[PDB]
Amino acid sequence: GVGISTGTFNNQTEFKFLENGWVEITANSSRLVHLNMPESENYKRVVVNNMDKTAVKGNMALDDIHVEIVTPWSLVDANAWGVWFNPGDWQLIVNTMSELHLVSFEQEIFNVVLKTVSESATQPPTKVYNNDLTASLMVALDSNNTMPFTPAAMRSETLGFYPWKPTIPTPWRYYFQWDRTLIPSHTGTSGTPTNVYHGTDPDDVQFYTIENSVPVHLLRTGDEFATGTFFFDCKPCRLTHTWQTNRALGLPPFLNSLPQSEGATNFGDIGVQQDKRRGVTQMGNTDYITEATIMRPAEVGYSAPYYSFEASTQGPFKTPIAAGRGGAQTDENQAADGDPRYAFGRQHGQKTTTTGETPERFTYIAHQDTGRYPEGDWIQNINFNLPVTNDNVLLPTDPIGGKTGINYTNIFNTYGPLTALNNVPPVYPNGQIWDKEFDTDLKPRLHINAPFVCQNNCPGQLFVKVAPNLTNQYDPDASANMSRIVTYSDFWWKGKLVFKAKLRASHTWNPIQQMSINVDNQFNYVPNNIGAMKIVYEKSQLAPRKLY
Amino acid sequence: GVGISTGTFNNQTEFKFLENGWVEITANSSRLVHLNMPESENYKRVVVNNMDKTAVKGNMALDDIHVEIVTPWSLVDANAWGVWFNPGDWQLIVNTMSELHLVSFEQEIFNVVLKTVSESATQPPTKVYNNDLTASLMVALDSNNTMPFTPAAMRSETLGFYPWKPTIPTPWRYYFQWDRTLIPSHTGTSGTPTNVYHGTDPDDVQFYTIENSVPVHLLRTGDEFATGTFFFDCKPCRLTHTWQTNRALGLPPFLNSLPQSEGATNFGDIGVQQDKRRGVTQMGNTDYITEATIMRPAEVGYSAPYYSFEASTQGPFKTPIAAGRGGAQTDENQAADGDPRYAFGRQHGQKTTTTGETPERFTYIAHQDTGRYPEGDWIQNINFNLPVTNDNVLLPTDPIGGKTGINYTNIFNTYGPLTALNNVPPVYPNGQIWDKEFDTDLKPRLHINAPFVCQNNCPGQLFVKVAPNLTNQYDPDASANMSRIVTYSDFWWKGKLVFKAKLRASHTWNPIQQMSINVDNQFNYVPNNIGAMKIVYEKSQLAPRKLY
Amino acid sequence: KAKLRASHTWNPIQQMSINVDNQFNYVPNNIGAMKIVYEKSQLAPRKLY
Ligand SMILES: [Ca+2]
Ligand SMILES: [Ca+2]
Ligand SMILES: [Ca+2]
Ligand SMILES: [Ca+2]
């Protein structure tokens, strides 16, 4: 079966308009994947330890020590928006749809090829490449998710984003249990804190092998491998944002006095003394009904401690947060808090011809308003008694623990039974699409890395590896290290991801926000005179939705 | 499937005589196509700017600045008469048929081969060619015409014209939007006119990719690709010309006096004073019924401004005209006006052994008489009053704008509701066969480049490309430029174009014009002692037809 | 009766949108004053040939 193709290249997105404003989006994606034989045909338990860094007082957050099992397999990950949609498809979906549903997923591997490299080491000297017609490509599909879930989008290692650029898979590796202790300190700390890696707890040791837990297929040139169709189990993802705050929920106060002339300084007037008003409040001990005092249904968003690192049995880790935000976009300098930052390279959006090893990055700033402005928070004594007196207020300016740069807001947490919150928004093109749910008895209410989380069923990971091409001399009983003919493989990948979307409706008199090409961004969507390209990030929930 | 052919070579033309003088012409054409891997596997946006030329006052017409998207694909175009008929087939069709109908079109790609070049760089040094049995040829057929319509005949880049000479496809590229301004000037102009390229309008930007909009097939040696049959939507094309002018329409004047002796100076005589005649005229204010004054049904042909360049958002362009012409063929020096000029090379008609880079060319001079002789035009004051006086005539000799070399005829336009006109005639072998209609709400009454214009349905373009053959070293994340094994491909193409013709009838006592080989042209249809060949152009509508 | 559009190119296209600049042409003022600003219909290229 050498001279016969086993598949088709398809990278088209189809919209199929059903009934009742629901369309079916079929995203096809094909790619040529390049794969070299493993640097080692063995599994390894490698420890990483950068104590030299953290040894410097004040650097706890630069902790990198961990342990991982390095396997001789590669992972073919296509779980990122950029792998399926191009800028033009995203604009259509994001501008005209109101919500998204993830439906199916299926892959395929065809037109496999295995070449060999011979050192034509003559003068120059040289190199020769030849087909190894009887060689094999090993393929394993972990349908039962026996293996550790390792989504590549987290480290910018998924398949590439351009239909016409060959891509590659990533070396697979997973974490191995270890104990580590790191006591925090600051520049003025004395003596040496405590920074040790304790080793492994035998009761938490799990060494996984693909050979032992997954059936492997050997594909020769004439072979093809096709995953069946996987049908997802999820909630819909919204493509519209909310802008309401507790301050904009409900019936506003009745203005007994309205302006009578156009004018920036012509305001309306409630026209009633603040302690002589009517309405409901939750401050049982005052007569002041204010817009900051009046009672609202519940609470949109919450407060959490910031740049808080917690520690458990294997080192410090940052305390997660859902969303960030602020008022008049002090943007960028605005950033920080809980706005995701993505760093990527030449294959996932960075300008293709860019030299150097510095990645490209961006901080995604969502349209939703469900965050907090710490500088505006404050706490005061129940007696109320305005104007508040210094000993009766704790402002986000007063120090804590004596530290000049720490407030109570840094320690603060206002999550409770009244917290209303939104799931995470899609991030094009670098964001991950779906995630696997934690196998704990009590699960997170949402995942900070993907808008879709398969509870029960999640697609299995696909592993690939070039089978060993040994030379006439091979001795299993020797330390050496098997020597094998330099072999590599190229195969085509093809996936199909199906969504179900709901067409949007116009509910207000005014137009709304839409994604569009303009004089300014115009050149982020076309190649240059050298064929250089780049894929700029874009927002998903542009279009307000009322919350209450 | 390596050692098995997937097709047949056929280059025969069949005439199948149906019923009622209608024959069916089946033209088969096969060719061996040679294709190298792309100079770049990327799409590029390249700008061409030759301001150095146009910077020279008086050279506006030598404007070449434009912008184009250079793709890594090649186009297999067979839309030219020479690709389907040889001189002998053309003579038969042109001499015995009266009209042509375009019916079907279908193509096929078989016996694909992919070789590799190894630098046997030893001493000489050397080169080695080897089959890459598992390599692929990428094929894409744009059935829905998603891509820009780029007919190769316009730049003499279609498949070759000899069944026994290997051919090649042309690198595909299409136009990209841009703004350009060029103010006209002449040799004596002062200062510098204004010649700038403004860039791109974001609202007109369209970057097309074949990968994203067309399904691609990968063919290995054992594979074949076959387009289904396309059935055209068109009007018939005529193979007879008209010779009548307004001056030869209707009942000629009754001669009251006829010659009585053979003799060049023995003329007939209307024998009635010009202002005492009967008939109809459209000059409500005179009694002169002349052959130049008498009323005719409508008007055959029209007048348009000549060597008129107009300008829009992207530079100057020549104002199109339908047909040219003149009386006693002042031929060649006659040319100019609106007679097409074709420049081509070794593969499309130029003498095969000819050295140098100068192309071969010809100006097609049609048999139809629907043009104008400006030198004979003139305008005069309504009062008439003959003999006309200088201040009452504007002759094509009197200057305009003060310019010594410009008449009113240069500015003149007489197109109107009474204009009778003919469609363009076929041009063998360099002319294009069919064209796609403009997607504007109001279409042209005809196209100046092809006798057949599919309104609704037009065949889709066929693109070809050698899939990337990577080496053991490929890094998607690097600026470099992928390095790949030098690969190339050879495949056979086979097309079938079906027409439907109407056999001609003899309507007059005298014989008519027929194409024939003679002592003079005899050697344009046979090879020489070295195997040199050439394909001389020929006319299609030789045989008069009465218009009225 | 309208026909929904399709995306035929890699790049996004021109769309009508509210922005910081035009924002107040679509809402009344403190006196109830209103206005209806003109807008364009054929924003989105189509290939002619
Ligand atoms: Ca233990
Ligand atoms: Ca906001
Ligand atoms: Ca514009
Ligand atoms: Ca004539």
Side-chain angles (χ1 to χ4, degrees):
Chain A
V2 332
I4 292 176
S5 291
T6 50
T8 273
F9 177 107
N10 185 7
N11 219 297
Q12 313 175 64
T13 288
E14 316 148 34
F15 290 69
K16 168 183 157 198
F17 306 90
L18 291 20
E19 272 320 310
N20 301 53
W22 277 90
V23 327
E24 176 183 62
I25 302 171
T26 301
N28 297 98
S29 171
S30 297
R31 220 126 298 184
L32 170 63
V33 186
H34 179 266
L35 180 74
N36 281 105
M37 52 184 219
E39 62 92 40
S40 176
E41 293 286 338
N42 297 153
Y43 288 80
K44 310 175 176 184
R45 183 169 99 261
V46 185
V47 177
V48 170
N49 178 154
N50 73 328
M51 275 163 35
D52 48 74
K53 250 301 176 312
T54 45
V56 172
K57 302 170 188 177
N59 284 343
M60 318 85 94
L62 302 181
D63 188 44
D64 270 339
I65 142 178
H66 68 285
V67 180
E68 66 181 64
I69 291 291
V70 176
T71 82
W73 292 79
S74 294
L75 180 77
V76 177
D77 204 79
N79 191 351
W81 294 101
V83 177
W84 309 89
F85 303 98
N86 62 22
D89 298 323
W90 195 252
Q91 175 189 48
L92 181 61
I93 295 173
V94 129
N95 281 13
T96 85
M97 310 298 172
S98 73
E99 76 183 54
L100 218 56
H101 297 245
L102 194 44
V103 179
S104 313
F105 179 43
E106 66 194 79
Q107 316 175 75
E108 187 184 297
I109 286 187
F110 57 105
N111 279 233
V112 170
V113 163
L114 287 123
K115 289 179 179 290
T116 262
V117 185
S118 44
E119 189 59 342
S120 175
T122 162
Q123 3 284 56
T126 348
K127 259 189 174 182
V128 202
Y129 306 96
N130 311 77
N131 287 306
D132 194 317
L133 297 183
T134 58
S136 301
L137 173 69
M138 305 200 274
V139 180
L141 190 254
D142 179 44
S143 302
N144 303 170
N145 287 293
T146 296
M147 243 71 294
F149 195 64
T150 60
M154 176 207 245
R155 319 213 89 112
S156 183
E157 283 180 41
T158 55
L159 253 26
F161 296 171
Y162 306 93
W164 60 90
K165 183 181 190 177
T167 189
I168 60 176
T170 40
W172 193 57
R173 64 271 178 179
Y174 54 91
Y175 286 116
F176 188 86
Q177 200 285 315
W178 80 90
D179 288 332
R180 192 297 171 82
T181 286
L182 173 59
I183 300 296
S185 67
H186 63 67
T187 276
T189 289
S190 62
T192 79
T194 275
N195 173 358
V196 334
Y197 158 78
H198 302 111
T200 305
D201 179 348
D203 308 303
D204 302 326
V205 172
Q206 308 193 94
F207 168 42
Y208 293 109
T209 291
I210 285 183
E211 291 75 13
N212 300 80
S213 50
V214 184
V216 179
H217 277 57
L218 306 174
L219 315 184
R220 283 184 166 174
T221 310
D223 299 314
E224 181 213 40
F225 170 81
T227 276
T229 292
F230 174 95
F231 291 95
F232 291 93
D233 49 334
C234 310
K235 309 167 178 170
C237 170
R238 312 185 81 167
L239 294 170
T240 71
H241 72 273
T242 62
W243 61 265
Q244 273 158 292
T245 276
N246 266 222
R247 286 287 293 265
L249 299 175
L251 180 68
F254 179 77
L255 308 186
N256 285 100
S257 171
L258 296 175
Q260 287 192 290
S261 316
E262 318 187 74
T265 297
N266 291 163
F267 302 119
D269 184 13
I270 288 170
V272 181
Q273 186 175 301
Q274 277 176 159
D275 55 66
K276 301 262 167 172
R277 294 173 178 176
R278 303 178 332 207
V280 185
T281 263
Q282 190 165 50
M283 306 187 82
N285 61 169
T286 46
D287 295 339
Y288 286 129
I289 301 180
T290 279
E291 278 289 293
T293 285
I294 228 281
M295 179 177 80
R296 309 291 177 178
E299 161 154 39
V300 179
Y302 70 101
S303 288
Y306 51 113
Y307 277 11
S308 165
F309 292 72
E310 284 164 286
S312 193
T313 68
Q314 28 213 46
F317 61 77
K318 199 225 155 195
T319 294
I321 214 293
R325 235 274 140 60
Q329 263 315 296
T330 58
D331 190 293
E332 159 185 68
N333 291 196
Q334 176 115 35
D337 277 285
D339 309 88
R341 181 117 169 115
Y342 289 76
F344 43 95
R346 237 62 62 55
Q347 189 163 33
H348 310 295
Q350 177 173 203
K351 190 198 208 180
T352 277
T353 56
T354 281
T355 349
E357 328 224 60
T358 310
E360 169 75 275
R361 40 208 156 198
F362 70 85
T363 297
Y364 187 88
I365 302 179
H367 283 299
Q368 81 190 340
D369 290 325
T370 53
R372 292 299 137 100
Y373 181 54
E375 290 82 332
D377 296 354
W378 85 83
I379 277 178
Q380 52 177 299
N381 186 295
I382 29 172
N383 294 314
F384 225 26
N385 285 326
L386 316 177
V388 66
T389 269
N390 181 53
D391 273 321
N392 293 122
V393 238
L394 189 63
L395 290 63
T397 274
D398 308 309
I400 283 297
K403 303 310 183 73
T404 264
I406 303 300
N407 316 305
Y408 76 98
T409 51
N410 280 107
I411 312 307
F412 211 42
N413 184 330
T414 55
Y415 179 69
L418 296 165
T419 297
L421 196 68
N422 287 313
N423 180 201
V424 114
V427 172
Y428 182 84
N430 304 282
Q432 173 173 158
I433 301 179
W434 66 81
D435 200 30
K436 197 191 72 185
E437 183 55 277
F438 283 11
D439 185 32
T440 53
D441 308 320
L442 309 194
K443 342 248 175 180
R445 295 183 70 185
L446 81 159
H447 278 209
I448 226 56
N449 63 145
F452 296 110
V453 173
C454 353
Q455 226 294 197
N456 304 294
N457 49 273
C458 252
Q461 320 195 86
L462 181 67
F463 303 99
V464 169
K465 173 190 169 194
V466 170
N469 216 190
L470 310 168
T471 68
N472 65 306
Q473 323 184 70
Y474 175 71
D475 182 15
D477 304 288
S479 314
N481 267 327
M482 84 179 89
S483 52
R484 60 248 159 98
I485 298 160
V486 171
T487 307
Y488 67 95
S489 167
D490 297 323
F491 54 92
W492 298 73
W493 173 81
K494 187 186 183 175
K496 190 183 193 175
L497 190 63
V498 182
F499 293 86
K500 184 144 303 169
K502 170 75 163 178
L503 293 182
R504 80 177 188 80
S506 163
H507 278 106
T508 57
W509 170 282
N510 59 94
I512 229 126
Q513 185 190 182
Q514 303 282 69
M515 167 179 163
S516 171
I517 194 176
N518 58 58
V519 185
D520 308 287
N521 60 212
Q522 164 178 43
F523 295 112
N524 292 166
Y525 311 108
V526 172
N528 70 182
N529 71 332
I530 286 179
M533 278 280 277
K534 89 195 290 185
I535 299 179
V536 166
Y537 96 94
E538 256 120 348
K539 297 169 181 171
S540 54
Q541 315 173 325
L542 56 204
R545 135 165 65 100
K546 79 188 172 70
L547 180 169
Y548 182 75
Chain B
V2 332
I4 292 176
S5 291
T6 51
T8 273
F9 177 107
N10 185 7
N11 219 297
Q12 313 175 64
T13 288
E14 316 148 34
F15 290 69
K16 168 183 157 198
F17 306 90
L18 291 20
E19 272 320 310
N20 301 53
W22 277 90
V23 327
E24 176 183 62
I25 302 171
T26 301
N28 297 98
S29 171
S30 297
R31 220 126 298 184
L32 170 63
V33 186
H34 179 266
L35 180 74
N36 281 105
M37 52 184 219
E39 62 92 40
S40 176
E41 293 286 338
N42 297 153
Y43 288 80
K44 310 175 176 184
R45 183 169 99 261
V46 185
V47 177
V48 170
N49 178 154
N50 73 328
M51 275 163 35
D52 48 74
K53 250 301 176 312
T54 45
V56 172
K57 302 170 188 177
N59 284 343
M60 318 85 94
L62 302 181
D63 188 44
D64 270 339
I65 142 178
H66 68 285
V67 180
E68 66 181 64
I69 291 291
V70 176
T71 82
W73 292 79
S74 294
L75 180 77
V76 177
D77 204 79
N79 191 351
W81 294 101
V83 177
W84 309 89
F85 303 98
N86 62 22
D89 298 323
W90 195 252
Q91 175 189 48
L92 181 61
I93 295 173
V94 129
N95 281 13
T96 85
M97 310 298 172
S98 73
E99 76 183 54
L100 218 56
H101 297 245
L102 194 44
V103 179
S104 313
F105 179 43
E106 66 194 79
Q107 316 175 75
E108 187 184 297
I109 286 187
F110 57 105
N111 279 233
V112 170
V113 163
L114 287 123
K115 289 179 179 290
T116 262
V117 185
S118 44
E119 189 59 342
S120 175
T122 162
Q123 3 284 56
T126 348
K127 259 189 174 182
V128 202
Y129 306 96
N130 311 77
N131 287 306
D132 194 317
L133 297 184
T134 58
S136 301
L137 173 69
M138 306 200 274
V139 180
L141 190 254
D142 179 44
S143 302
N144 303 170
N145 287 293
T146 296
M147 243 71 294
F149 195 64
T150 60
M154 176 207 245
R155 319 213 89 112
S156 183
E157 283 180 41
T158 55
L159 253 26
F161 296 171
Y162 306 93
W164 60 90
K165 183 181 190 177
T167 189
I168 60 176
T170 40
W172 193 57
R173 64 271 178 179
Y174 54 91
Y175 286 116
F176 188 86
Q177 200 285 315
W178 80 90
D179 288 332
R180 192 297 171 82
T181 286
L182 173 59
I183 300 296
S185 67
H186 63 67
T187 276
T189 289
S190 62
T192 79
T194 275
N195 173 358
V196 334
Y197 158 78
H198 302 111
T200 305
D201 179 348
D203 308 303
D204 302 326
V205 172
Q206 308 193 94
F207 168 42
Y208 293 109
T209 291
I210 285 183
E211 291 75 13
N212 300 80
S213 50
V214 184
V216 179
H217 277 57
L218 306 174
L219 315 184
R220 283 183 166 174
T221 310
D223 299 314
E224 181 213 40
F225 170 81
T227 276
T229 292
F230 174 95
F231 291 95
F232 291 93
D233 49 334
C234 310
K235 309 167 178 170
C237 170
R238 312 185 81 167
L239 294 170
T240 71
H241 72 273
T242 62
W243 61 265
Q244 273 158 292
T245 276
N246 266 222
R247 286 287 293 265
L249 299 175
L251 180 68
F254 179 77
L255 308 186
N256 285 100
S257 171
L258 296 175
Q260 287 192 290
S261 316
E262 318 187 74
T265 297
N266 291 163
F267 302 119
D269 184 13
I270 288 170
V272 181
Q273 186 175 301
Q274 277 176 159
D275 55 66
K276 301 262 167 172
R277 294 173 178 176
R278 303 178 332 207
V280 185
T281 263
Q282 190 165 50
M283 306 187 82
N285 61 169
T286 46
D287 295 339
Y288 286 129
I289 301 180
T290 279
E291 278 290 293
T293 284
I294 228 281
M295 179 177 80
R296 309 291 177 178
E299 161 154 39
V300 179
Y302 70 101
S303 288
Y306 51 113
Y307 277 11
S308 165
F309 292 72
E310 284 164 286
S312 193
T313 68
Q314 28 213 46
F317 61 77
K318 199 225 155 195
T319 294
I321 214 293
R325 235 274 140 60
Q329 263 315 296
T330 58
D331 190 293
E332 159 185 68
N333 291 196
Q334 176 115 35
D337 277 285
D339 309 88
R341 181 117 169 115
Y342 289 76
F344 43 95
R346 237 62 62 55
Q347 189 163 33
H348 310 295
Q350 177 173 203
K351 190 198 208 180
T352 277
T353 56
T354 281
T355 349
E357 328 224 60
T358 310
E360 169 75 275
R361 40 208 156 198
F362 70 85
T363 297
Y364 187 88
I365 302 179
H367 283 299
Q368 81 190 340
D369 290 325
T370 53
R372 292 299 137 100
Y373 181 54
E375 290 82 332
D377 296 354
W378 85 83
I379 277 177
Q380 52 177 299
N381 186 295
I382 29 172
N383 294 314
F384 225 26
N385 285 326
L386 316 177
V388 66
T389 269
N390 181 53
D391 273 321
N392 293 122
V393 238
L394 189 63
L395 290 63
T397 274
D398 308 309
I400 283 297
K403 303 310 183 73
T404 264
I406 303 300
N407 316 305
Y408 76 98
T409 51
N410 280 107
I411 312 307
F412 211 42
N413 184 330
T414 55
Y415 179 69
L418 296 165
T419 297
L421 196 68
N422 287 313
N423 180 201
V424 114
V427 172
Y428 182 84
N430 304 282
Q432 173 173 158
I433 301 179
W434 66 81
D435 200 30
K436 197 191 72 185
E437 183 55 277
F438 283 11
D439 185 32
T440 53
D441 308 320
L442 309 194
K443 342 248 175 180
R445 295 183 70 185
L446 81 159
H447 278 209
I448 226 56
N449 63 145
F452 296 110
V453 173
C454 353
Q455 226 294 197
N456 304 294
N457 49 273
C458 252
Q461 320 195 86
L462 181 67
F463 303 99
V464 169
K465 173 190 169 194
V466 170
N469 216 190
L470 310 168
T471 68
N472 65 306
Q473 323 184 70
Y474 175 71
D475 182 15
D477 304 288
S479 314
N481 267 327
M482 84 179 89
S483 52
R484 60 248 159 98
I485 298 160
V486 171
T487 307
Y488 67 95
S489 167
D490 297 323
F491 54 92
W492 298 73
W493 173 81
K494 187 186 183 175
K496 190 183 193 175
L497 190 63
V498 182
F499 293 86
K500 184 144 303 169
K502 170 75 163 178
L503 293 182
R504 80 177 188 80
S506 163
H507 278 106
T508 57
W509 170 282
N510 59 94
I512 229 126
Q513 185 190 182
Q514 303 282 69
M515 167 179 163
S516 171
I517 194 176
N518 58 58
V519 185
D520 308 287
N521 60 212
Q522 164 178 43
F523 295 112
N524 292 166
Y525 311 108
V526 172
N528 70 182
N529 71 332
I530 286 179
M533 278 280 277
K534 89 195 290 185
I535 299 179
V536 166
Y537 96 94
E538 256 120 348
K539 297 169 181 171
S540 54
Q541 315 173 325
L542 56 204
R545 135 165 65 100
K546 79 188 172 70
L547 180 169
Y548 182 75
Chain C
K1 184 144 303 169
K3 170 75 163 178
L4 293 182
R5 80 177 188 80
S7 163
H8 278 106
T9 57
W10 170 282
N11 59 94
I13 229 126
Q14 185 190 182
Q15 303 282 69
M16 167 179 163
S17 171
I18 194 176
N19 58 58
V20 185
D21 308 287
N22 60 212
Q23 164 178 43
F24 295 112
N25 292 166
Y26 311 108
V27 172
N29 70 182
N30 71 332
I31 286 179
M34 278 280 277
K35 89 195 290 185
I36 299 179
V37 166
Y38 96 94
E39 256 120 348
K40 297 169 181 171
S41 54
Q42 315 173 325
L43 56 204
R46 135 165 65 100
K47 79 188 172 70
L48 180 169
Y49 182 75

